[PDB]
Amino acid sequence: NEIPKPVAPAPDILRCAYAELVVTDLAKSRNFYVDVLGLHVSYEDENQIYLRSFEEFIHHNLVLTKGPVAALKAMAFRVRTPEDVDKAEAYYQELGCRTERRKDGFVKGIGDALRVEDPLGFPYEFFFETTHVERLHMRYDLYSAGELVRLDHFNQVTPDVPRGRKYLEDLGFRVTEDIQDDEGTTYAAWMHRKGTVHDTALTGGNGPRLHHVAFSTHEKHNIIQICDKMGALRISDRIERGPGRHGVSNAFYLYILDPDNHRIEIYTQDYYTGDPDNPTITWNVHDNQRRDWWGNPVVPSWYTEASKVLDLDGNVQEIIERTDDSELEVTIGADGFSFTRAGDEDGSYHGQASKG
Amino acid sequence: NEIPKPVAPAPDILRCAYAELVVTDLAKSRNFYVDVLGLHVSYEDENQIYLRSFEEFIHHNLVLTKGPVAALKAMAFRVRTPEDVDKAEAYYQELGCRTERRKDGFVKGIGDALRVEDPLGFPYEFFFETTHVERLHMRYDLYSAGELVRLDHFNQVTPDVPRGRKYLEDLGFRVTEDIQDDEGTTYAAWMHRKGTVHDTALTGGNGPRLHHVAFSTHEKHNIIQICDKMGALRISDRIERGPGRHGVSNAFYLYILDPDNHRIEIYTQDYYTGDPDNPTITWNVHDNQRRDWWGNPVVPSWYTEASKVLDLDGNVQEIIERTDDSELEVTIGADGFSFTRAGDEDGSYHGQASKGFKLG
Amino acid sequence: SNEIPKPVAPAPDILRCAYAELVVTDLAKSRNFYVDVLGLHVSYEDENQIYLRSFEEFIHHNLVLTKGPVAALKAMAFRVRTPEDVDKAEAYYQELGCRTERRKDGFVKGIGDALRVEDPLGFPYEFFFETTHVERLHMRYDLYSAGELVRLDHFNQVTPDVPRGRKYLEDLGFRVTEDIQDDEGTTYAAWMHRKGTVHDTALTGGNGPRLHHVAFSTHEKHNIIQICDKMGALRISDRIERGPGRHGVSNAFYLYILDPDNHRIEIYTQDYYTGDPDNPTITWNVHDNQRRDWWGNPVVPSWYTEASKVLDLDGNVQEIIERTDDSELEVTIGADGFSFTRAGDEDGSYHGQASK
Amino acid sequence: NEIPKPVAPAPDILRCAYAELVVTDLAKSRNFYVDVLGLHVSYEDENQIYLRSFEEFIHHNLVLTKGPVAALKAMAFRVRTPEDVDKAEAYYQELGCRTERRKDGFVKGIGDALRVEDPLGFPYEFFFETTHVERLHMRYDLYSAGELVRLDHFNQVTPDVPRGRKYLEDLGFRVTEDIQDDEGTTYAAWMHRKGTVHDTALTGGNGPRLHHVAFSTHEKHNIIQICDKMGALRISDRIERGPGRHGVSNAFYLYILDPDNHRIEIYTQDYYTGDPDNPTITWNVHDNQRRDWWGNPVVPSWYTEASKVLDLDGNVQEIIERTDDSELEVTIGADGFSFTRAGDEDGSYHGQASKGFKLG
Ligand SMILES: O=C(O)Cc1ccc(O)c(O)c1
Ligand SMILES: [Ca+2]
Ligand SMILES: [Cl-]
Ligand SMILES: [Cl-]
Ligand SMILES: [Cl-]
Numbered sequence A: 001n002e003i004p005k006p007v008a009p010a011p012d013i014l015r016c017a018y019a020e021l022v023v024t025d026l027a028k029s030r031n032f033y034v035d036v037l038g039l040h041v042s043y044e045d046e047n048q049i050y051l052r053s054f055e056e057f058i059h060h061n062l063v064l065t066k067g068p069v070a071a072l073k074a075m076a077f078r079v080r081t082p083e084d085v086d087k088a089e090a091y092y093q094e095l096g097c098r099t100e101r102r103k104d105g106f107v108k109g110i111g112d113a114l115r116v117e118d119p120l121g122f123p124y125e126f127f128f129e130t131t132h133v134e135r136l137h138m139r140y141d142l143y144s145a146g147e148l149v150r151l152d153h154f155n156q157v158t159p160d161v162p163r164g165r166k167y168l169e170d171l172g173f174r175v176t177e178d179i180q181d182d183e184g185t186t187y188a189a190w191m192h193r194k195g196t197v198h199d200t201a202l203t204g205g206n207g208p209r210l211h212h213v214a215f216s217t218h219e220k221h222n223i224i225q226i227c228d229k230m231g232a233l234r235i236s237d238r239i240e241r242g243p244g245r246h247g248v249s250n251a252f253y254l255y256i257l258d259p260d261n262h263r264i265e266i267y268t269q270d271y272y273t274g275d276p277d278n279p280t281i282t283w284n285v286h287d288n289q290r291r292d293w294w295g296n297p298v299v300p301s302w303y304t305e306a307s308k309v310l311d312l313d314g315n316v317q318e319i320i321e322r323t324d325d326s327e328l329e330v331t332i333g334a335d336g337f338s339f340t341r342a343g344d345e346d347g348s349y350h351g352q353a354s355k356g
Numbered sequence B, D: 001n002e003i004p005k006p007v008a009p010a011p012d013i014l015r016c017a018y019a020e021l022v023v024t025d026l027a028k029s030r031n032f033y034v035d036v037l038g039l040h041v042s043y044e045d046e047n048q049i050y051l052r053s054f055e056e057f058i059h060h061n062l063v064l065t066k067g068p069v070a071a072l073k074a075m076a077f078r079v080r081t082p083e084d085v086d087k088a089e090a091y092y093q094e095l096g097c098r099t100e101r102r103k104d105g106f107v108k109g110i111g112d113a114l115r116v117e118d119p120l121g122f123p124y125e126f127f128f129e130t131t132h133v134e135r136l137h138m139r140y141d142l143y144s145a146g147e148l149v150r151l152d153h154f155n156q157v158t159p160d161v162p163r164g165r166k167y168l169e170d171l172g173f174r175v176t177e178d179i180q181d182d183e184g185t186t187y188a189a190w191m192h193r194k195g196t197v198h199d200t201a202l203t204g205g206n207g208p209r210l211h212h213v214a215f216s217t218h219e220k221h222n223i224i225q226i227c228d229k230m231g232a233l234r235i236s237d238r239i240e241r242g243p244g245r246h247g248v249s250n251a252f253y254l255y256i257l258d259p260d261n262h263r264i265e266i267y268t269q270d271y272y273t274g275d276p277d278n279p280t281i282t283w284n285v286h287d288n289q290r291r292d293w294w295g296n297p298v299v300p301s302w303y304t305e306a307s308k309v310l311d312l313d314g315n316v317q318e319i320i321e322r323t324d325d326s327e328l329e330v331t332i333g334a335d336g337f338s339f340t341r342a343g344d345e346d347g348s349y350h351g352q353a354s355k356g357f358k359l360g
Numbered sequence C: 001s002n003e004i005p006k007p008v009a010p011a012p013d014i015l016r017c018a019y020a021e022l023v024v025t026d027l028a029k030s031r032n033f034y035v036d037v038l039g040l041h042v043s044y045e046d047e048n049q050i051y052l053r054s055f056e057e058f059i060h061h062n063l064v065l066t067k068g069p070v071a072a073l074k075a076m077a078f079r080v081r082t083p084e085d086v087d088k089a090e091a092y093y094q095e096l097g098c099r100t101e102r103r104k105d106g107f108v109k110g111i112g113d114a115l116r117v118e119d120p121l122g123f124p125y126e127f128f129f130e131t132t133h134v135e136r137l138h139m140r141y142d143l144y145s146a147g148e149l150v151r152l153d154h155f156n157q158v159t160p161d162v163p164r165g166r167k168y169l170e171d172l173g174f175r176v177t178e179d180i181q182d183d184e185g186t187t188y189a190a191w192m193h194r195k196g197t198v199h200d201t202a203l204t205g206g207n208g209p210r211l212h213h214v215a216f217s218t219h220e221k222h223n224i225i226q227i228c229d230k231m232g233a234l235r236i237s238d239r240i241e242r243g244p245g246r247h248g249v250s251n252a253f254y255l256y257i258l259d260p261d262n263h264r265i266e267i268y269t270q271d272y273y274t275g276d277p278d279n280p281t282i283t284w285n286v287h288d289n290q291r292r293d294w295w296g297n298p299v300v301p302s303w304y305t306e307a308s309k310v311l312d313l314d315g316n317v318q319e320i321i322e323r324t325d326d327s328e329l330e331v332t333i334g335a336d337g338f339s340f341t342r343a344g345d346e347d348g349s350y351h352g353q354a355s356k
């Protein structure tokens, strides 16, 4: 049922800022994120690793926290002013959501912060205050052939996309692209605060689950190098999907799996969305160029697998089942369909994925 | 001489949107911007060419207007709402500036628009309404090896950088980087509204003049290809400076000259500046990696040459001489100095440019 | 045995692969693919043929498209070092008992004295020295496409008995650089060279003679990406067969696409130097899931089963001989096949299924 | 003083294979070649460092030998068979050159080898036997953003280019490109054995001196990264020239200087030359696109500075002065000139370099 628009003003959200991920083996996770992927350590101890991308000046973009059950603990957005943390708290209380505020932060390098169990069951954090660190954007002495340069977005699995979309729109996120069919079903939506295609996105599925966290590279060859490195390390089985060109977003991309199966996307070269009348793009779910522009098939695991999320007590959120049609089933399942050219039988696929 | 902060609220500016350049030979200019550089035509007739970048959805990023004297006619910024055009009007009127309002626009594909003679003598346009066109961002069947994908920024030559900087800060532009010395002189500042290093910038010098308009590419090889193509067309004399890596902005770059000597920068891969406490970077004017990170010398024309700007009547604005120290003189001139490593004489340059060159 | 005995006559000194003549059924449709989509440069054309070359070529052409009733390879041509090498080629193939045809004025425009042969594997080979030089476009950056094809790199031939063909090609002066074998002693594929790259031709085990593909190179990996992107924009992504990827064998970045008659074209870049005579030969195990695609992406079955007909010297289709040796498709992705990411490790292995 | 063609057959040369450079401080040289540039160690001790590129399978491409005077000690070419070492010995003996044969090599990982003081005063080595090592071409776990993938070529400074060219042609090198003027002077020539633009090249100047050793990258961005890294390390003063696109060779390039001022070129994407009638390309010396296609000026040090070379006793070879015209002088000197378009004054430079600089 619809989530009401509060009377209270929404906080001014700048961008996605960091994710806190619970991991089971801190050493194995460090090897993946630091040794394989080259993220930069801002702080570490025996319980947590704080990591940042090459161009970041805030304390971190990723916190790995040792715990018993691998899951998303918080997806954090930075707000414009300290007063926006107050606005966030008032807004979510009006929404009837559980909130927790700590003046000294939940993780190192973040000050006054509000965590909330949002209407879709996700742990959101809003903060302004953060400890500045050395911005490594010109440290070409450190630069990796696969260098991850920015945190770009999150992607959330939720059972009712329109319900979630309206809520995020009220919160100030503008939809840039979406996937629908001719029967009124929405399968996915992308929405932004900062001037890129998205800061978060909704993928229709059983939820709440975290689909992925995405980092940017400068160039397409940097993504290719990550694949090449993973072949050399003989861990190509942890490449899930890609590399490719997205239809939706137009970005070059790759999806890989961390030691706890948390999915990480590598992403580059989407477009500017900062104008308020930025044209919304709607794709048909049966268009075989919507996810991979080259028509490469989307592996079923990409649709079915995603990370658990925690509530404010650190317990796993119960999963609610999607009743709307499944993107997997309608495109690549036994009764699925996709096309290369709308209305052309040639280059269409019935009851199977593209390319054989 | 300080420009006061108006009581009237500043318009909410989104980004640089387009420039209108007066050109003397429309066909020669079209050859440069369309045939050489690959910009996309939104409209053209005997008097004007309207051009846009690969990823743009507003009507245009560049208007070429035939006229007797080559000059910048307007640098245009898009504002967030129609109401912001009224705000801009009230703001500049409070500053004591001349303003002109046209409900149906000054150029095709722009609606209600305000043009102003700003306090630094520059013709700024503010608008919201614009005719949307086909966004070509996935038209890879059109994509050039040198494709210009966005309009990124303007750069303005002005004699008193602190005076201009304060005015633009009150307008909502935050300074991301600057160049100063230890004697209190500011030589240049970069300032933004959209989340990149800048939408405009001030370069110290006699002004008002337009230093350049900058377009972005996706990747560094795209900029390399523009150079390569200019060599194949045997117009390498129109490559002024570059390609290089900037210190300030960290962008890969190239400067080229159009048929009327309007300078165009091609630019890629600067960083995100959208957070309100984005760290402001100050480089010393004597640091030889500040403009070109690799230490390549900055050709003197880059410091001395820039385009005329017009007032609202279309007449050239009179030039006011800079009295602050000259970046050229203090770095590559007779009594100039630059260093590679602060405090190291090794890799320093005295009275000449880096890499074995002197001023011609 | 059915070995191809080494002639006493000296082998012609072969420089490199030089051009292919492909018979096509609709010349205008083929022109649109090779010129408009792929950007090859016209060296001559009329109502029956189109002659095309790559960006860095100075000989007359790398590809001749000839209108005919049945799409097929008509000749795969190698340039020899001197005019006398055409004589050597004729004596060599005559000793092998092969049908030969010598045209002192060439078979196609821009080639002079030329010998065509029905080789012992049933392939139409041409050997020539004389060719009309044309403008080398290597610095014509005013013409350069975002997907520019810069050189002709190699051919790949489907033949039933790889060792038989390999020894024949070795006698002809081709050195094997890489191959794929199993522990039981079966050879599935071999790559072999004259010029200093991984190959000028290659043998893929299968029913033959059939032409598997013709390969062109690009300068950089982004040029191959652009070809894919362009094909998506033209809504012909169904003509992208496999890739883009990193090869295991050759280490080259690659893509396979299909022309209007289903002739397969590979785009290829950045293999390694093989010109030293003791260049180390690399043998991969057939069950290694990084041998073909280094990133472990699956090889679609059509890549193993589909290939172009070849013609005899009368222009008739050559009869096909079925492979009796084990099938690479069957032993890797068929019902009883398997592959591994790490030898000996069931984690990352695939059984009776392809990867991913 | 022409060098006659021997009756004895030339050795069959495959390619350039390695250079032995004498360096004065082994640790500082190691920092440059291993830490800055990322070359791979095949062997090292207190006296020498043996280095190879990413795709090499022979033992090394570069030997750094500690010694009192920095210099080229040997430029080594691999020959096709063991018997070609005997052919090289007979060939150079017929030429009247000093030869030294060591059945177990001069440096580690090379077997039977011949070193000669060649007719141009250069120390050449010919060998077949070399210890194979792990070919790192797919070791993407090691791959750096600036990875050097192959040894491509040498470049030699010699006073009489036609005299040297003839000698190298008799040895089997074929000329691919050269630079001449209308009055019949030759300034430079490029020549090959393997199917690239060159394995060695001759630059007119006082000699024998070693101009540079060149390594390849996969892509242009790899060269850009080397520049970026040198800026981050605050050693941009060791970037001599570039990055650029060459006219001659069409390769993307960069020139940097090691701790002893030995010049290293980074290079990529030249073209195939393996056909025996490969078209030769001759450029006019006044063509400002011949060296840098984009017309960027050639720094005077590029023309004047080069490394000493040693004789077989390890003593520095005496230098012979060039008497033919100087490329520096005829192009960028006070009486030089260059053009963008032949015959066009627009885009031409007289008495100075392109882009607005004169000689420092
Ligand atoms: O199938 C693969 O991926 C192996 C491979 C390597 C080199 C090639 O040129 C080719 O066509 C196939
Ligand atoms: Ca001072
Ligand atoms: Cl997707
Ligand atoms: Cl600059
Ligand atoms: Cl040069």
Ligand SMILES: [Fe+2]
Pocket (backbone or CB within 6 Å): A153, A154, A155, A212, A214, A265
């Ligand atoms: Fe994503």
Ligand SMILES: [Fe+2]
Pocket (backbone or CB within 6 Å): B153, B154, B155, B212, B214, B265
């Ligand atoms: Fe700029």
Ligand SMILES: [Fe+2]
Pocket (backbone or CB within 6 Å): C154, C155, C156, C213, C215, C266
């Ligand atoms: Fe191939």
Ligand SMILES: [Fe+2]
Pocket (backbone or CB within 6 Å): D153, D154, D155, D212, D214, D265
């Ligand atoms: Fe060189």
